[PDB]
Amino acid sequence: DANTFFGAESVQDPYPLYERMRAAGSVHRIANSDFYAVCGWDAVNEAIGRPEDFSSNLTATMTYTAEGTAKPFEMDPLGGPTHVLATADDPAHAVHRKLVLRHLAAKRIRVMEQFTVQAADRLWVDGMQDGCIEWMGAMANRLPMMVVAELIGLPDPDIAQLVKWGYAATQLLEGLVENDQLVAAGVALMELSGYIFEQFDRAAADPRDNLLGELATACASGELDTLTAQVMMVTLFAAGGESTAALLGSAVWILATRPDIQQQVRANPELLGAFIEETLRYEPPFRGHYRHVRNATTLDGTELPADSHLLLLWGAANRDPAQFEAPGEFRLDRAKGHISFGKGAHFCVGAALARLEARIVLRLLLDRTSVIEAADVGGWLPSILVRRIERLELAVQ
Ligand code: HEM
């Protein structure tokens, strides 16, 4: 594959790849695999609007052999009970989404704001020494994991552990990182799982006003199964922790490497919300999400066999030249949006929270500095699904 989704180049910068795929059409088979890249804006919107045809159950991911050949990493079949929340179809999906939304209501977000302000300040104090901070390990990796742990109700977490735990599932699900990294991720996910099961067993005996308690209560009344509830909580670390970490990393990487953009936001602090939205458009934390194709059908004109899969490429949709002027240019004056939080039945429940974490953290960084520059920029996580920088050493004044 001239158009492979893995390899050093695609990991570093996948956007030219998406434009090549788009030449073949808005939907296009990946090599000779059973996966079809969805790069068109209208095609992604159509797909997400057809949950009956394109299930969210994660029945397979795309992986690559050592020989570089795409192949399916098969998981739980269509309709299975392992599919929860973001990967569940209705009716279970709507129950799951309702329960989690209770912990993301307006009042909940206000509490989170106070929590985030205090946590961000402590992280900055600990991490910024002699005009230097490694942004990923000190801030971007930690803060969003602490927020997910607080939403769930975990007591006074070991932050070092949380980061490991929170990044484990992506690595395991793709099987793209090296074997030693995969073994460590498996240990990490075992540890995370076991910790959640321990905390849930304790919540069931005395439910408190957090998602653990909400779930313990809903299980007691028969609304869902105990194991389903525990798995739901496990998945929130990748869903809400890793994704937000990625945004915090990319936003800063852009500030640090585009002085013109950084001066614009400094000079006109009212452009911070636009800058966050443009980062979401231009470097979405998720490269994509899968769907399972239930029956032979068509999407935006393109044929799809039964039991194939879609890869919904949010980043590629956000650069569709039918929808956006100057799609490849980072601009602070746009007034269409983006599809980086999805749309429709599974539209991100955490979007307000994510946007709040970005606003708090980025305003702290900008308010406390006069100039930020990149001293050393690491590589990106080897992934087909997630767009996360691994290391970003800043020099500040
Ligand atoms: C920048 C940060 C974030 C991005 C880019 C992001 C993106 C997404 C996307 C694209 C979807 C739809 C997936 C699909 O259609 O298959 C989604 C769903 C979801 N997001 Fe996020 N998200 C972020 C932050 C968060 C946070 C902070 C939380 C929770 C604390 C969260 C929880 C979820 C959940 C539970 C769903 C599934 C909703 C449902 O199935 O009804 N997200 N998110």
Numbering used by the authors: 37 to 371, 374 to 435
The paper states:
P450 monooxygenase enzymes are hemoproteins that typically catalyse the activation of molecular oxygen and the insertion of an atom of oxygen into a substrate bound close to the heme iron. The Mtb gene Rv1777 (CYP144A1) from the pathogenic strain H37Rv (which encodes the cytochrome P450 enzyme CYP144A1) is located in a region of the Mtb genome rich in genes encoding proteins of unknown function. The apparent exclusive conservation of CYP144 P450 family enzymes in the mycobacteria suggests the retention of an important catalytic role. In addition, the CYP144A1 deletion strain was markedly more susceptible to growth inhibition by azole drugs than the wild-type Mtb22. These data point to important function(s) for CYP144A1 in Mtb, and possibly to its participation in the Mtb stress response mechanisms.
The N-terminal truncated version construct of CYP144A1 (CYP144A1-TRV) was generated using the previously prepared full-length version CYP144A1-FLV/pET15b plasmid vector, and by deletion of the region encoding the first 30 amino acids. Consistent with this conclusion, it was found that the CYP144A1-TRV form crystallized readily, allowing the determination of a high resolution (1.55 Å) X-ray structure of the ligand-free CYP144A1-TRV enzyme. The CYP144A1-TRV crystal structure contains two monomers in the asymmetric unit. However, a dimeric solution state is unlikely, since solution state MALLS experiments indicated that both the FLV and TRV forms of CYP144A1 are soluble, monomeric proteins (as are the majority of bacterial P450s). Both monomers in the crystal asymmetric unit have a similar overall conformation, with an rmsd of 0.55 Å for 393 C alpha atoms. The structural elements (F/G-helices and BC-loop region) important in determining active site access and substrate specificity are those that are most distinct in CYP144-TRV from other P450 structures. The relatively long linker region connecting the B-and C-helices folds into an extended beta-hairpin, that occupies the region between the N-terminal beta-sheet and the FG-loop. This creates a large access channel to the heme cavity, approximately 10 Å deep from the protein surface and 10 Å wide. The active site of CYP144A1-TRV is predominantly hydrophobic, with Phe321 and His324 side chains located in close proximity of the heme 6th ligand. These residues are likely to be important in determining substrate selectivity.
